[PDB]
Amino acid sequence: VFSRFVEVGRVVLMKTGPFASKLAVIVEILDHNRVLVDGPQAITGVPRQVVNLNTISLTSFVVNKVTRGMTHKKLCLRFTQDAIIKRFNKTATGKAIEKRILREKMTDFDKFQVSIINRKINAAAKIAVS
Amino acid sequence: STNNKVTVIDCHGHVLGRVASVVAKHLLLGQKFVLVRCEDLQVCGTLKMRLVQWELYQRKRVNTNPTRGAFHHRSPADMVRKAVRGMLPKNNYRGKLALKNLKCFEGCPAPYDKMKKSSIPEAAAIYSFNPTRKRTLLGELGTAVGWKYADVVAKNEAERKERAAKWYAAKQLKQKAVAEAKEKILADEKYKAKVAILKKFGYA
Amino acid sequence: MKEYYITARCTDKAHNPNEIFRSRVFAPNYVVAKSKFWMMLKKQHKVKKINAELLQCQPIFEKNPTVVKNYQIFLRYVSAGGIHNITKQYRDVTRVGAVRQMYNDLASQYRTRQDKIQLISITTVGDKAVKNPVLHQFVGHHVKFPMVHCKPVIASKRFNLPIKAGKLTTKLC
Amino acid sequence: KCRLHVNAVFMGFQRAQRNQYPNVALLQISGVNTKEDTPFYIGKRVAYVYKVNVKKGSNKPAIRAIFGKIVAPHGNHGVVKARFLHNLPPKAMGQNLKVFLYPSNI
Amino acid sequence: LEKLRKSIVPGAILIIVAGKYAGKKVVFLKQCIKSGALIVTGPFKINGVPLMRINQRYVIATSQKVDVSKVDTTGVDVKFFKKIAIKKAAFGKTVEEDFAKKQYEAKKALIVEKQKQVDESIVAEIKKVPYLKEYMASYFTLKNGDHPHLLKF
RNA sequence: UGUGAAUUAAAAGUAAAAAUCCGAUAAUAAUGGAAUGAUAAAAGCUAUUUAAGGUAAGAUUAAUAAAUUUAAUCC
RNA sequence: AUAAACAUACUUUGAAUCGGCCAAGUCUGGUAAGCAGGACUGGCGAUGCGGGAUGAACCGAACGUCGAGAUAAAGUGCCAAAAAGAAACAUAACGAGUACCACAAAAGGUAUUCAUUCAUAUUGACAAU
RNA sequence: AAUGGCUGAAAGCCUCUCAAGCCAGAAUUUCGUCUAGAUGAAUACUUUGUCUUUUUCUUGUUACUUUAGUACAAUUGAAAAUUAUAUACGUUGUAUUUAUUAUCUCGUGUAUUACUCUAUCAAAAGGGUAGUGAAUACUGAGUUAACAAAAUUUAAAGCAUAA
């Protein structure tokens, strides 16, 4: 049976546009193609808007007691109560999102040490195996 | 520089025409392509529909001399070459040179069975097809029209899966050993100076 | 598609200059909105541009472009056979947003170009007033479906490589 | 010694369906998949370095070059326009062109 | 006199991306006011890059900065660079083939070392930063996935 | 018992921050180039003087105000 | 109102020509014709260029020799320079695919999508038991 | 193929399917068989073992002859299958060209390798065993660079002898 559904309260992940790699919460379903994401603008910065399902991805979290057309005020309370930000950052995608931000601020000197250091570690770890 | 490498394309689960368009464009850009498993491509149409198109194709033949007539190659590796050749410049040095950098084989011969394989997301059958649209493998169509070597390739591919399966298992064991040996020396006290740099950028 | 509020008056012998014609016209730009507005006057009141003064032509903006509403567009279109009246429902957040759906849907199902359709009216209906067989399935509060066969998303054209490495997978998403 | 250039493919001249203008050559820089990554390369040096099998008694160099500059983008798929000192030989279509890192504005 | 880029400040480390010393890293001391070219030194004990002049269009300003005051640049002006330049044998000066350049390097060698007293300060400081001496002495390279429009220095 | 389109009270708010959408526009500018040129002084530009002016909008304060309203003295 | 001084009015001498053909929100004879003949205009003839694969007339636009830039008709999977996203009715078929253009009709289908009207719709309609 | 059927929904029933999935059915199609046939493969003998061109002898080919020039062993490139994919995760976001810290010396042993070479068993294998070398990690230290130069990828002449 399918695990992740496009329902009301499902936490989605924007994959393109100005809010790429920012969390959002579905609060309405117009049809099979468009949903209304209101990933709390006071928390993540995603405005209440209609987006196509080709631009987002589902996650393993659903916010509890979210009704369709929930207001921004009450939605924010349920978002922090579930602690989605805390839970999301421990997932494989959550760590991949922070990795990309970490790498994009490296300098040429920063990349020099990592390539040198990791090469020795990998070589040494291969030696240690009989 | 000079790109002497070969871009090996695994034609499994692709579309015949969509593969050719991407390959035939990049043959004109100096790249050398080898398309292994050109008998696993997919064409839109049931086996009944594909045979009608082949029957129409076989009709085109010079009336006064069939030896000069259009040559209808039944082998899937020659179906792909014909499809690619239709998307290349005709009757010029540029077109002929770009065609010399292309080869299919129905299976995976000795050099190209251990090279790194690529994929063409534009030509994948899971991105361009309705799942309920019936398709036809080139090998299955080739057997219907008179390609005799459909059983040699199926036998050769069978033993290539049994050789790779044991190589993959052996490689998995060594990788697990190296992975667990890296954790031990990542947590060593002497390597803290180096590791502290890696943790800063998230590598470790 | 943008919505406009257009008014005008007729100043000649036939029409008294104290009755103002208002309209709410959906047009790509205000020049087309006046063009639609003048035709409705000439074809319904014998009022011509050369004997009329336009007063106001202002855009109308959605009050709450964050609330999902069910619309009901009453319209008439011309086919090969004759002229018919249709009532099609749409779900969107803006009045102009639903109208563009109607124009694109009519031109696909009925093959009817835009210069055959006259939008009589557009209102907002209840949740149970929707009768479209497909659109009725998403009006409930407990709608839920898994989007299968997802194509993996690319952040931007920056990473759009022609040839990739390895294998390709869809997503249960 | 080191790699200080990015290979670009000399696809062909600026052309139409039945015409051709060899003054401007189109290049496909590696890793530039869109026209928004082009502003970095507008102005960078570009060289077509080829090899000539000279005879022993000839004093001409065995490695010659034609240089040029990237001047503007061409389409939405990160294709650039390059103008050289001398128009590139049409025998060099599909070959590699060194895209340097200077004039540097970094 | 050219207007140098805001990223190019004295003591910063630059990457030479053109010319004879392509791919090397140097330290920018100051700008030759009489010619507008930068006066850099990739300290000779580290990179082997001597004291020279390079136009600012052939260098990339990295974020790594060696600073270093008291560099003692009392000489090293337009006189010094014109003194150590190797000039041709004119036109009417007999024939003087081959040997002219070989002797020139020998006689100008001594003054070249004399002005390398500048490097005595940066060399000591460079060793303070871990992995920096290895970084300076090594050629700059563009590896796989190193797209110049994405790199930042 | 919960959500709630809309409306209402109080706090805050002189009602120009930033982001996205929607409308509106495109040109003044800054930084890199390209094609054809030029090289010398300027109805150049800069500094010092007095002072036509600054029509929402050069600033502030006052009277008051759904104001491109009226004054004052500073720049 | 608008435009017009290399404007306007001409005078003299003379060349070539009076086989024409095409298009159409036009017509007459004809079953019709790439047939015959007309009204108004624009073309081809006398005319190359970009596009329609190719084409006297179609579409854009009319040409001294060139450099750079926006454009026109029209295009953007490959030949072929140039696109990404959205919604649909299509597509189990030599079906669909760039006007003039190089073809298809009447009729039929418990095939399919949408809309209108009517009746049955429950405390129980239809199908089956 | 036409056609006749099976299970079976849509449409609680019915139905061979303008549905998925099957069967039977032609002087039919394709294998099999016959004729011509391109690129090819195996074996026998003659050679050669980094390479080419211009000449040149011969009926012709190969080896062969002369004068040069050129490189000299040692990190490259593989899971398979599915995609409504057992559950979980969604591991996000740049394929090839193109991922090595300048050169040399000094150093100690151990370990490792789809590394090179030798011997052997095998083998149309990124094979096993034994040894050697190379590179790397433990892991250092020291010399040199300033001007100049850092390139093959092939040229030119012959016929003694053998097949």
UniProtKB/Swiss-Prot annotation, chain E:
Main localisation: cytoplasm
Protein name: Large ribosomal subunit protein eL6
Keywords carried by this UniProt record: Cytoplasm, Endoplasmic reticulum, Ribonucleoprotein, Ribosomal protein
An example Gene Ontology molecular-function term: RNA binding
Role noted for this protein: Component of the large ribosomal subunit. The ribosome is a large ribonucleoprotein complex responsible for the synthesis of proteins in the cell.
Quaternary structure and interacting proteins, as annotated: Component of the large ribosomal subunit.
Keyword Metal-binding: no
GO cellular component terms, A-Z: cytosolic large ribosomal subunit; endoplasmic reticulum
Residues of the full protein shown: 52 to 204 of 204
UniProt similarity note: Belongs to the eukaryotic ribosomal protein eL6 family.
